[PDB]
Design a binder for this molecule. Structure first.
Ligand SMILES: [Mg+2]
Ligand SMILES: [Mg+2]
Ligand SMILES: [Mg+2]
Ligand SMILES: [Mg+2]
Ligand SMILES: [Mg+2]
Ligand SMILES: [Mg+2]
Ligand SMILES: [Mg+2]
Ligand SMILES: [Mg+2]
Ligand SMILES: [Mg+2]
Ligand SMILES: [Mg+2]
Ligand SMILES: [Mg+2]
Ligand SMILES: [Mg+2]
Ligand SMILES: [Mg+2]
Ligand SMILES: [Mg+2]
Ligand SMILES: [Mg+2]
Ligand SMILES: [Mg+2]
Ligand SMILES: [Mg+2]
Ligand SMILES: [Mg+2]
Ligand SMILES: [Mg+2]
Ligand SMILES: [Mg+2]
Ligand SMILES: [Mg+2]
Ligand SMILES: [Mg+2]
Ligand SMILES: [Mg+2]
Ligand SMILES: [Mg+2]
Ligand SMILES: [Mg+2]
Ligand SMILES: [Mg+2]
Ligand SMILES: [Mg+2]
Ligand SMILES: [Mg+2]
Ligand SMILES: [Mg+2]
Ligand SMILES: [Mg+2]
Ligand SMILES: [Mg+2]
Ligand SMILES: [Mg+2]
Ligand SMILES: [Mg+2]
Ligand SMILES: [Mg+2]
Ligand SMILES: [Mg+2]
Ligand SMILES: [Mg+2]
Ligand SMILES: [Zn+2]
Lengths: 89, 43, 119, 101
RNA sequence: GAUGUUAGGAGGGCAAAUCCGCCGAAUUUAAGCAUAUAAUUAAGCGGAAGAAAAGAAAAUAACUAUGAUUCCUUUAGUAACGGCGAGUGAACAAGGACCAGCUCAAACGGUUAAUCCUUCGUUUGGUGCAAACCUUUCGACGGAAUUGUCGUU
RNA sequence: UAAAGCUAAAUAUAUGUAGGAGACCGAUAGCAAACAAGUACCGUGAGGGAAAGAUGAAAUAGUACUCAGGAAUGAGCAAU
RNA sequence: ACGGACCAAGGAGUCUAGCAAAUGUGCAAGUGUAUAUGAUUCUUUAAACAUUUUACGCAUAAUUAAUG
RNA sequence: GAGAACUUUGAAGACUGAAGUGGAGAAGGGUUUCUUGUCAACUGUGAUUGAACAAGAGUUAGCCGCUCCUAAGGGAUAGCUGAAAAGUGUUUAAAGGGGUCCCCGUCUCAAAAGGGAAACAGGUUGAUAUUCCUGUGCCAAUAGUAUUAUGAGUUAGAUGGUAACAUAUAUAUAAAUGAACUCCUUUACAUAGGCUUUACACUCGGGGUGCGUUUUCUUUGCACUUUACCU
RNA sequence: UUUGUUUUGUAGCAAUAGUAAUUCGUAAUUAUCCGAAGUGGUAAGGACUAUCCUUGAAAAAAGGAGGGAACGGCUUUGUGCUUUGCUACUCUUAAUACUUGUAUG
RNA sequence: UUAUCCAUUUAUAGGGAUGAAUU
């Protein structure tokens, strides 16, 4: 078999099993299965495992800007009432 | 190939933009380059 | 270059007019940039800033008007409501927390924790 | 049928949705576009990625003395739409080019 | 009982070190191994908070008796469990930290549900430059509720 | 005095943020990561996962000028 | 017989628990202030100091399966 | 060009030999395309070349696709399981459409080769073309009210033809009443075998044009002599 | 209105476009583009015939039929329906105008 | 038989004597 288990067979490797994943952006959305390998995309849930500590660390709350959360931090310290500015002049 | 989804096309464009070198003037005040043949975008 | 303190006094229509003019100017600058020019390429930034300022002024005016419109009246838009951490919103108001069953209240009134200096 | 005592969310801000300024960004030079302008009275504009043909037409009508017969568009690989705008026979793209700049 | 894009609201997801529920192994130890051990652990699934849980005795004692829970020092590697092998193993008392008690149900009040809530309001205040807040008692119009609200202990 | 319910404190904290300390480590160490590091890169994928600090006081002293060179460079009676 | 092409750096009896022996030290029928408190203790001080104006451990007695 | 066995042009000699290193596409790649530069590294020899490096540019659609349909299938709704996570998909549902209350009825995704509204030619760019240009069409929409015209029919719904069936030729065959409710058909189908018909290709002979051979021979050898969808 | 003869039309698209020529200028003119046939490689269609314990998708969408629901318009009177009086009507494409969100891709 | 269970359909007339079929 010219298309035998090694190099010949690597020629027949076209056609993605995974594409890009809405939600994770991580090219791990199993197309045929319609399920992301690193998310469980359609499952409303993130699919993280205590057995994968590295994995956990590489997608936690800190990793990526925190558009709103960051802004809200310091507010407690300030304890300013909402709607209130400082005094002018 | 020659029939992409819009998203994919946009990603490709983004990658291309990323590719280009440091604007030289900045150097007076890059390691993530990728050549299309040797390293894949893996999309 | 128009700074906000001038703009607060202006009426909304006037503000809008100003904004449109600024936008037009910006567009012109962009066009120039696109064409082989670098004469007033650096002018654009200032214009952009001005536009932003104008937008801010107008937006705040609008918000104020909205607030005036929905003064009191129990319910309000969720924008004009007290945007505040969800948990806090959920939480019982201090008064509610305080509220005592009548007997307990009576007890409290009668036998409050006294001050009593021991000697 | 809804009859809410007050509306849920009221964006009092000036609209974020793209006006003429913002929709259509700038004309193209480049030899191609110049050629187009010369030969077949088609003006080439770079536009926002989220411009429609209708929208672009409207923008052109508003931004200039232009009447457009047909608008072709395409998404460039630089994340811009390039809109080829063929003017009605009454107008000379060259004259309008001059007017714009 | 369905039905509603009815009016108003709530849940969903992220994060987890501590925390609460389940669910639940095996490597390992026993110089083998099967009960044991690992371990009521890891992983899995769910759920909270600035802490959680526990908590006001169907408790311990057998004393001259103590007196919610939690935690520390100890009791104690003890009583006990265990191919009584390997190994596992508390509790009370004692000394502290800290200390806080309570309300439903049931009993009672029918010369009358006194309760409670939604919507609409009304008019004294207080801090604020505004924004908002803060409280003040007064009715209506709705309902809820006698298949039980409120007071009394 | 079971078969209903609530409850602050002492207690815990390898998570996050912010402080402060050290008979700690000193770039093959210390976090995987002192640096555009969970980055590059590999894996279809679950995942795997680096290397890489130091001129000088000052580059607002980063190599002018001349000669030889196609140029790189080299040389200098030239220069910081 | 095996390992060693060369060189540089890294690179392996450690730390805790509890027991014992040895030796030092204190006090000695006692000893150890354990938690915790207290102080005119507060960069060091997360140490040091103190112990209320019969706690507990181990020892001071053994032996028995045991009431003892 | 500093420098040329492997850059370019010409002249030879060769090969690929229409089952092609030729034209088109799919998957995959992702700007590798294109021009202008250009040589530190890379282009396992050289290199002035390059799919390298740098600067810019480049992808135009009602008709080509996707978009719609359903297929093997997938994900869900109801429940029902399960501590949940998940596992099953009418199993005991009060599960949106069509007509003027009755009558139907899970939803959704799954084909860039199945089903399917409609496009052809020539020209044009450094790089795109059934996508731009010129020309010529085609398809589907096209709300109401009011005029206009166009033709039909009636003075409430044409005629012909024995029949098979035909007939609206108005700019354009537009119009031949038709509701509920039904019933068909198209969509819509295997493989083999030859037979036939047309187009395309190839070829032959003649006429016309040009080029080639010409010591000798050759009314000669070669090229071109074209015709699209649409009506 | 049907028969005879002739001249056109590459049936329209269409020669204005292509091709091969020929000149003339520093883009324009001209001449050409047409009379017979064979081979049966490829494709498609046709009518068939044969094989099967194999009989060879579905739906959107469209069409046809069956059926006979409903039925002119305007004006006047009474509570969408009934009565009374008059004759241009019901379709049908195309254009045009006007309000209704800006009524073509 | 009423629990339970199975089947059947649009949950379609209570038990006995090779056309059309709908308002
Ligand atoms: Mg697959
Ligand atoms: Mg692809
Ligand atoms: Mg490759
Ligand atoms: Mg397009
Ligand atoms: Mg949750
Ligand atoms: Mg063993
Ligand atoms: Mg062993
Ligand atoms: Mg074994
Ligand atoms: Mg766990
Ligand atoms: Mg609690
Ligand atoms: Mg204890
Ligand atoms: Mg002991
Ligand atoms: Mg155990
Ligand atoms: Mg209790
Ligand atoms: Mg509790
Ligand atoms: Mg390191
Ligand atoms: Mg040997
Ligand atoms: Mg050996
Ligand atoms: Mg060796
Ligand atoms: Mg070695
Ligand atoms: Mg000793
Ligand atoms: Mg070579
Ligand atoms: Mg050959
Ligand atoms: Mg050969
Ligand atoms: Mg190229
Ligand atoms: Mg080389
Ligand atoms: Mg080049
Ligand atoms: Mg490149
Ligand atoms: Mg098509
Ligand atoms: Mg559908
Ligand atoms: Mg199916
Ligand atoms: Mg499923
Ligand atoms: Mg689909
Ligand atoms: Mg198809
Ligand atoms: Mg090309
Ligand atoms: Mg011609
Ligand atoms: Zn994902």
């Amino acid at each position: 078999g010219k298309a035998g288990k090694g190099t010949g067979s690597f020629g027949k490797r076209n056609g993605k099993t995974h594409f890009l994943c809405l939600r994770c952006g991580k090219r791990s959305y199993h197309l045929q299965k319609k399920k992301c390998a690193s998310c469980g995309y359609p499952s409303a849930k993130k699919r993280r495992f205590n057995w994968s500590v590295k994995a956990k660390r590489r997608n936690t709350t800190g990793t990526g800007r925190c558009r709103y959360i960051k802004t809200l931090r310091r507010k407690l310290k300030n304890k300013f009432t909402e709607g209130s500015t400082p005094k002018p002049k | 190939g020659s029939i992409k989804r819009f998203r994919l096309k946009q990603r490709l464009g983004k990658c291309r933009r990323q590719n280009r070198p440091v604007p030289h003037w900045y150097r007076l005040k890059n390691t993530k380059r990728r050549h299309w043949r040797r390293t894949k975008l893996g999309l | 270059n128009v700074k906000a303190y001038e703009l607060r006094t202006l009426k909304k229509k006037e503000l809008l007019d100003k904004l449109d003019e600024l936008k037009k100017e910006l567009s012109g600058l962009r066009i120039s940039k696109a064409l082989g020019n670098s004469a007033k390429n650096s002018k654009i930034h200032g214009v952009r800033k001005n536009v932003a300022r104008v937008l801010t002024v107008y937006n705040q005016k609008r918000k104020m008007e909205l607030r005036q419109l929905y003064k009191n009246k129990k319910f309000k838009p969720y924008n004009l409501r007290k945007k505040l951490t969800k948990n806090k919103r959920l939480q019982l108001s201090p008064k509610q927390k305080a509220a005592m069953t009548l007997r307990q209240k009576k007890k409290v009134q009668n036998f409050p924790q006294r001050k009593y200096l021991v000697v | 049928a809804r009859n809410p005592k007050c509306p849920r969310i009221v964006k009092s801000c000036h609209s974020k949705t793209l006006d003429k300024y913002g929709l259509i960004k700038y004309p193209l030079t480049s030899e191609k576009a110049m050629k187009k302008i010369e030969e077949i009275n088609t003006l080439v504009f770079m536009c926002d990625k989220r411009a429609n043909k209708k929208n672009i037409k409207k923008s052109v009508k508003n931004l200039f003395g232009i009447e457009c017969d047909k608008v072709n568009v395409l998404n460039t690989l630089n994340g811009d739409k390039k809109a080829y705008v063929r003017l009605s026979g009454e107008h000379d793209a060259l004259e309008v080019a001059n007017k714009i700049g």
